């Protein structure tokens, strides 16, 4: 729509805060989405059917 990223300098400086995704964030985005995915695994030995019997029964 506007605001060319020719080197990251246009004359109105505010325009680069439209969709800011700066690469300190996107690497912290992956190290969080990895670790949130790794944490939310089924912990081994977790009475898996006994969770199922409550969650159908309740």
């Amino acid at each position: 729509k506007y605001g060319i990223n020719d080197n990251g300098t246009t004359e109105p400086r505010v325009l680069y805060q439209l969709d800011r995704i700066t690469p300190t964030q996107v690497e912290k985005f992956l190290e969080t989405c990895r670790d949130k995915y790794m944490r939310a695994q089924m912990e081994p030995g977790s009475a898996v059917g006994a969770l199922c019997a409550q969650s159908i029964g309740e």
Binding site: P12, V14, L15, Q17
Partner: protein, 122 residues
């Protein structure tokens, strides 16, 4: 130190009907910049009426010992929290401000920064 200022004309004191007893949401229009803003104002302390020219100044800082910018007579304090012709959403605790339009003069703004209002009737 001023981020942004102009003279504004409040046109709808409350656009969709009075919802609160102490806060009414104004709709204004600038003078020759054409910055629409949708500002909430505590009207119990500072009553505003239809068609009232009032100044508005957005400042990052105010400079009782350092002798603050106090020529104005209604001062809030809040942070910008969204930039979406740019909109520029400012929140004042709960009181929203959606200063809009013409991104060349809006250049001083950013996100996550503390912002004062300094209003004054005319």
């Amino acid at each position: 130190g001023i981020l942004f200022e102009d003279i504004f004309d409040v046109k709808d004191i409350d656009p969709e009907g009075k919802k609160f007893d102490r806060v009414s949401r104004l709709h204004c229009e600038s003078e020759s910049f054409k910055m629409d803003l949708i500002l909430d104002v505590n009207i119990q302390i500072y009553p505003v009426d239809l068609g009232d020219k009032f100044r508005l100044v957005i400042a990052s800082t105010l400079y009782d010992r350092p002798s603050r910018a106090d020529q104005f007579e209604y001062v809030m304090y809040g942070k910008v929290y969204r930039i979406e012709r740019l909109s520029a959403y400012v929140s004042y605790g709960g009181l929203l401000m959606r200063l809009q339009g013409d991104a060349n003069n809006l250049h001083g703004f950013e996100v996550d920064s503390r912002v004062y209002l300094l209003m004054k009737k005319l």
